[PDB]
Design a protein around this ligand. Sequence first.
Ligand SMILES: Cc1cc2nc3c(=O)[nH]c(=O)nc-3n(C[C@H](O)[C@H](O)[C@H](O)COP(=O)(O)OP(=O)(O)OC[C@H]3O[C@@H](n4cnc5c(N)ncnc54)[C@H](O)[C@@H]3O)c2cc1C
Ligand SMILES: Cc1cc2nc3c(=O)[nH]c(=O)nc-3n(C[C@H](O)[C@H](O)[C@H](O)COP(=O)(O)OP(=O)(O)OC[C@H]3O[C@@H](n4cnc5c(N)ncnc54)[C@H](O)[C@@H]3O)c2cc1C
Ligand SMILES: Nc1cccc2nsnc12
Ligand SMILES: Nc1cccc2nsnc12
Ligand SMILES: [Ca+2]
Ligand SMILES: [Ca+2]
Lengths: 588, 588
Amino acid sequence: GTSQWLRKTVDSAAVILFSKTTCPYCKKVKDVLAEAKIKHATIELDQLSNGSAIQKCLASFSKIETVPQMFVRGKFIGDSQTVLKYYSNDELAGIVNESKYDYDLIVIGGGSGGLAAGKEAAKYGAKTAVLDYVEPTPIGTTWGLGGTCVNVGCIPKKLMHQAGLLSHALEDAEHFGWSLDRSKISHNWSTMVEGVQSHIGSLNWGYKVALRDNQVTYLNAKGRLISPHEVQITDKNQKVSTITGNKIILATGERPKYPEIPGAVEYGITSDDLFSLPYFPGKTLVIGASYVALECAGFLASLGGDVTVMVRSILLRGFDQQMAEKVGDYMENHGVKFAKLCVPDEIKQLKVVDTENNKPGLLLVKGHYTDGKKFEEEFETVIFAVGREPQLSKVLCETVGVKLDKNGRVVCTDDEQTTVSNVYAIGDINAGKPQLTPVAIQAGRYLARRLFAGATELTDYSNVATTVFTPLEYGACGLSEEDAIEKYGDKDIEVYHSNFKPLEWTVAHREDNVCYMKLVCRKSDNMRVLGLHVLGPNAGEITQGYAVAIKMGATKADFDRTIGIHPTCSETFTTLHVTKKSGVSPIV
Amino acid sequence: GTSQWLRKTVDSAAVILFSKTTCPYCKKVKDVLAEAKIKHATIELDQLSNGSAIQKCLASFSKIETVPQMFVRGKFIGDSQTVLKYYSNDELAGIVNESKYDYDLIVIGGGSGGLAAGKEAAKYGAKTAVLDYVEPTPIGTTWGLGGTCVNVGCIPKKLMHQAGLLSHALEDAEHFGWSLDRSKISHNWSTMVEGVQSHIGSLNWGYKVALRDNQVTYLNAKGRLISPHEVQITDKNQKVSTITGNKIILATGERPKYPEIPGAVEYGITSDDLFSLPYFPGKTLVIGASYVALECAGFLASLGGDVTVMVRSILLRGFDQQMAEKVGDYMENHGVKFAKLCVPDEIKQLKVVDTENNKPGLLLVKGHYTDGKKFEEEFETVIFAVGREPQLSKVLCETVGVKLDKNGRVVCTDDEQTTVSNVYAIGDINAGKPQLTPVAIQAGRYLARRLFAGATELTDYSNVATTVFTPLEYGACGLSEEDAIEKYGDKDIEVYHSNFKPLEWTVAHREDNVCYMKLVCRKSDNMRVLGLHVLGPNAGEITQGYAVAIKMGATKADFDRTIGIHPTCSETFTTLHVTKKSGVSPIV
Ligand SMILES: Cc1cc2nc3c(=O)[nH]c(=O)nc-3n(C[C@H](O)[C@H](O)[C@H](O)COP(=O)(O)OP(=O)(O)OC[C@H]3O[C@@H](n4cnc5c(N)ncnc54)[C@H](O)[C@@H]3O)c2cc1C
Ligand SMILES: Cc1cc2nc3c(=O)[nH]c(=O)nc-3n(C[C@H](O)[C@H](O)[C@H](O)COP(=O)(O)OP(=O)(O)OC[C@H]3O[C@@H](n4cnc5c(N)ncnc54)[C@H](O)[C@@H]3O)c2cc1C
Ligand SMILES: Nc1cccc2nsnc12
Ligand SMILES: Nc1cccc2nsnc12
Ligand SMILES: [Ca+2]
Ligand SMILES: [Ca+2]
């Protein structure tokens, strides 16, 4: 197995140095390369269990078993002497720059995963190009470098969430003694958007600067893979050209879906438009029930908006449905209206958006409930959050041979490789993976290390924790209760649960027995924690640390013998004792 | 070893039933006892690895090997038949109530640990009495049932912390778009104290109700242990009497120390007085540098007070000193003044406290710096936070034989047993243990299970996580960096660290590169995480979950292969890569 790994490492690395820590000639090579600003991977064989066997198999490539050994793009360059020879003769730059391709790596997509991968690859000497282009939304919205999370996802989403949370902080401030009349305080949408967009701009810029500092080429151009190693780029000026790369990383992400009803594209918006909307949405209808729909509905309501969510069937399909209902119940009790069991039929325009005064238009939404009653109501803004989809036909020529699944996502091995061996896919377009920013980052960085630094560490996609930033946040790690029962049988599942009340909520006169947490455990596996679920403030901060313990195979006993930090919400996980089987009430 | 455990279990349990799940006569006994409202412990032998050997050793007590077997206070009562005989003959109440002592358990101290222990003991049929008395502070401050945390510690402390945090929420609200002028908002101390004291009152009451519902006798009387089994109680009316108990739990906690300088007792206050103070402290001097001192100084400043902390030498002695300095630096940059290397010499009174208008007095504090310069400044309130101490001479007659250490704390075995075999100590008075509310609760509950339900689980006092609720919170679990280097040598310690910025702080224009986290790891033990440290918002929520993973022996690799939740502060722990050895800057 070692021989197989070395052959792949040598073929793939752009510039790699085989060396040892306790080695003088190696350090001489290292310091030379550093002075010439030649980045490279390094593998200290003395720090590997199979080092000596690798040092021996190396001779199959270099005809020698000594260190240091320096390779460039699959070719042995030389020992200490031959490198200094190339250096003193000022032939070294041309040697390390010699390639069949323009780049060692072309990243198509400048998002969470693509930027992470490209940055990490350049760290090890890979000549890297990052392509990013943002196809405007139907109304013309566009944005800068960074992807969905940075521009029209997590970042603006959580900042607007924060602005909504401050609403309740303003309410709580009175009970804690602050001379404040919440009822005389209003929110200015455009002031918030200005600050949100200023921060996004600082990220767009920080990314450009980061790529320049790491000698990464950034091209604001639409990329199209026409052969395994050839990418066709169209720039702002419609100019077409071709660049070649050894490895290709597809990281193009997804975009929001629209329902196929009249008026939807013309008069509605999506999350892509919401976070830079130059006017307050006003009375808003959110169509959909995903975490995007509920998060957006949630903070609009907390900002004082008249918000309605049109729900076709259930909330947060794919999430623990007990928790989903508690999420929705909280929102419905805190200003969010729900048109349940209802779908839209058409969007009719009543007022055009006022560009000059920054005011929304006005729309008539027609729909129908399952009970046959008609839905007809006026809204100033209609937001569709009915899923997202890849658009790889715009990126992949069918002739290249990259296998897509029925949903249009890329079918990959557990090392992100597509059916074209030099082409990989990371992030949301990777079929079957959790569609989250830290997953894409870890996938891209770990892939870059395997390609160009000889690493073997794969990304672990199991038990990836999540948090839905609804008005009351919901964090989760592992299986939902229903999936655990499905997988192992009701008799083999024990569920410990408890309501709780944040100490912060007491003086503030907020609700008993609404915040809630549960551990879904497997009786036959020493009460292994299969899933953790918490509804309450700062649920992301609560949940994160437990994800490490679950990764390690935490049991209920592991939670119990850990001591709580008091007063916190998270400590309740260390004293859970009421089981669902017992029928005892979880209230406190 | 089994025989030893059974002998202790039988001797100690008040009412215990040996049984099996798949047993008909057992359920008959259970249902009888339930109807008669006789609480008891139960041990299903079919759910123990050593069950059959226990069922056999049982005959050494009962002369039989069958189930069910019912014991009362060390005496076999009978099988199914003999119980129903006692029941039908209405002799069963007198049997289970038969004892040499008035109580199976007398808890001296109605605090975190004592109430937890007493409640859990009654759950298994132990006739329990909880004694609580609150010796007034020098100025006459007193409070109700619950202990230090409930009345004059964590609970009011964190609520006032929350009131201080709301100050910055009010500041942040503007940048997030809220039509709010922070500069025109003031804080009303007495309104906050009213709400804080209302919540404490609901806890005082909830505890009384809980003890009544569990048939626990609550005595508001000063307890004094005069012999192993005899407690002398003095009530409000100075009436003296004696009650006897089989097991005794000492849970009397500590009280604040005063420095031996003129004016300190007469004119200063402590935390015991702060949280019900009927007047705003005004310009305040906090003398001390513990987490109490900094927490109290912190929230007073955030409420707009003119606050000074007089620090003799370093901050937070016993905590990681890198983190302590970052804590202090943040406070000094956010309105807290520090009189460094300074001690007090005397407190002179300039104004008496105004009882009628609720206004503080006025004090002249005289002291001196290490450089010889005199300290002389006027303060309206002077708070001493210079440590806490037990007062067991007021509780333990020297003749009983309970060994105390030099500091006056009880020297205990790892099962909380004192040098008097029926007397145990939990909580802050237990020498050498972390002085925290969840430790006392876990100790008391687990002890109660060992005494009266045959449990063997001990409390694990290692790697207990902490959080200091200073204006910028500091959570920690495990070793400080300096202690790890002391214990294993600098060469065997790797420290990964990073600054970070909460997303919430970006639009709010708060500080880059102030929040900070580090993992202190042991190179030779697979990079085992010896200590985790985080300075930032919600640090208690962040830290808790990682305490489980550290309990399980988390390595750095365990943190790395876990995926982050984005956007959170806690996710930064899953991507740490800068080491201290590397000299690379931790900034972002
Ligand atoms: C409202 C919303 C909120 C979200 N909140 C969270 C959250 O809180 N936490 C979390 O973990 N995840 C969240 N997500 C998901 C997160 O944004 C994605 O998982 C993440 O962006 C995926 O990164 P990626 O690299 O796979 O794709 P992307 O980030 O979308 O990057 C793809 C980039 O490639 C561009 N591109 C497309 N085609 C081409 C082409 N031919 N040539 C060049 N460039 C091209 C795209 O325009 C884009 O710029 C949210 C998503 C949405 C819509
Ligand atoms: C300002 C302050 C803030 C704190 N914040 C935190 C925090 O955030 N998180 C945390 O985990 N810990 C915190 N602590 C520590 C926490 O309060 C203690 O660890 C906890 O109270 C210990 O519980 P205990 O049972 O050992 O003692 P206690 O809670 O103090 O209970 C002892 C009870 O017994 C009474 N008593 C004494 N003598 C007698 C007698 N002869 N007869 C009858 N009754 C008697 C006492 O008056 C008292 O009511 C804080 C402490 C202080 C002073
Ligand atoms: N529990 C709930 C609240 C609001 C809308 C819903 N659709 S399904 N379940 C719901
Ligand atoms: N870093 C610090 C800030 C304020 C007071 C201090 N005493 S010691 N170190 C300190
Ligand atoms: Ca616990
Ligand atoms: Ca990670």
